[PDB]
Amino acid sequence: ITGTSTVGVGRGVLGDQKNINTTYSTYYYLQDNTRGNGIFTYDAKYRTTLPGSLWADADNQFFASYDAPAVDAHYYAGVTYDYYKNVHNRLSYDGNNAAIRSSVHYSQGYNNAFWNGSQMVYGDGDGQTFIPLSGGIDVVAHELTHAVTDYTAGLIYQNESGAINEAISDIFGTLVEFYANKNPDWEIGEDVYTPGISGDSLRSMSDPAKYGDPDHYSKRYTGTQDNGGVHINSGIINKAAYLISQGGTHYGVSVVGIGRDKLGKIFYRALTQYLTPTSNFSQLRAAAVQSATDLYGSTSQEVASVKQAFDAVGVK
Ligand SMILES: [Ca+2]
Ligand SMILES: [Ca+2]
Ligand SMILES: [Ca+2]
Ligand SMILES: [Ca+2]
Ligand SMILES: [Zn+2]
Structure with a gap:
């Protein structure tokens, strides 16, 4: 969407507080305009239909338990982008600043995460084998790295x-x-x-x-x-x-x-x-x-x- 870049705050899967880059246009959206062509986080609403809806929030505060996996997917995709830029001089996964997209709340009790050729997808887990998978930065960076590999060595x-x-x-x-x-x-x-x-x-x-x-x-x-x-x-x-x-x-x-x-x-x-x-x-x-x-x-x-x-x- 087109709007004004701003910064919101929320709590991630492990209960830690962090700042996230959002965009304002009537609602506040999980759209970070500060990195490449953007980082976008979507709600799959417990379905398997992708990407779902760009994440919209009324008050730019993300403290609801439903919010937590979105906060972490959005934030850790930013960190991963920053790693590739600052350490290896690579702009996003394709090297030309492609937009990074993630959906969370994929399916019901889904104990995995993946790159599907076009975006990242994160399950919530079943609550005993896994909690929501975007809570792990190694997991997020693992999935995004699959996109890097796909655009390079293949x-x-x-x-x-x-x-x-x-x-x-x-x-x-x-x-x-x-x-x-x-x-x-x-x-x-x-x-x-x-x-x-x-x-x-x-x-x-x-x-x-x-x-x-x-x-x-x-x-x-x-x-x-x-x-x-x-x-x-x-x-x-x-x-x-x-x-x-x-x-x-x-x-x-x-x-x-x-x-x-x-x-x-x-x-x-x-x-x-x-x-x-x-x-x-x-x-x-x-x-x-x-x-x-x-x-x-x-x-x-x-x-x-x-x-x-x-x-x-x-x-x-
Ligand atoms: Ca809110
Ligand atoms: Ca454990
Ligand atoms: Ca680790
Ligand atoms: Ca660790
Ligand atoms: Zn893998």
């Missing part, structure tokens, strides 16, 4: 290339979590998963095998479930990425960590410059070595650590 959602597609979204979801810097960790979905059980998460990057995911290529899932294990075999790449950043010894191979910022730069370059729709794990290793080489020199510690990290997870 990794197909199947088999090894799909596992890479998933790992990239976990990796940047985590980097965005650290960027916003409120209790960042190397776990995925911990803020919105199983409100009744503390200390757990959906997936772990530091130790994928904690939830039964492979942490070595020898343990890869070779069956047909989950599109050939795109959410399972991503553990192998997530572990490699954790080692590149933080360091450690894994299956007897020692890796000197080079830190989060270099991890991000190396993987963003691999993604946007060297990966293709059918890239496999061995091709990712090559893309990542070449990226680190480009950025830091063939005889750097950075290149050395990328090699040891992929050796440690058994990717040659």
Whole structure:
């Protein structure tokens, strides 16, 4: 809609208060005009019809419990946009400031979130396995990163290339979590998963095998479930990425960590410059070595650590 940019206030899924950019025109809408061609948040009204209605509010105050997932979807999409702009010089997901759209209150008791080719979509959860999924910044950044991948490398959602597609979204979801810097960790979905059980998460990057995911290529899932294990075999790449950043010894191979910022730069370059729709794990290793080489020199510690990290997870 056309109107006047302003700032409202609300409370997110976890009960925290935040300021959100809104637009005023009779109602106040969840439309942030300060970022690219805009961030837009929609109410799907417990249906599966998308996008639903642009979120309208009478008083620019968003403290109702119905409001909470909208507040967080809108706010964390802004943070994710800011991460890509400030850290990687990328304007929105397509690199030309495409408008970012999210719908919340999708369906009834829906325990997931996704990018559907055109926008983000967030379920409310069933209240015991998940609370509303937009409450996790790693989840929001994970979904938006799928749009980035789709506009760059185009990794197909199947088999090894799909596992890479998933790992990239976990990796940047985590980097965005650290960027916003409120209790960042190397776990995925911990803020919105199983409100009744503390200390757990959906997936772990530091130790994928904690939830039964492979942490070595020898343990890869070779069956047909989950599109050939795109959410399972991503553990192998997530572990490699954790080692590149933080360091450690894994299956007897020692890796000197080079830190989060270099991890991000190396993987963003691999993604946007060297990966293709059918890239496999061995091709990712090559893309990542070449990226680190480009950025830091063939005889750097950075290149050395990328090699040891992929050796440690058994990717040659
Ligand atoms: Ca209100
Ligand atoms: Ca966290
Ligand atoms: Ca996390
Ligand atoms: Ca939990
Ligand atoms: Zn994903």
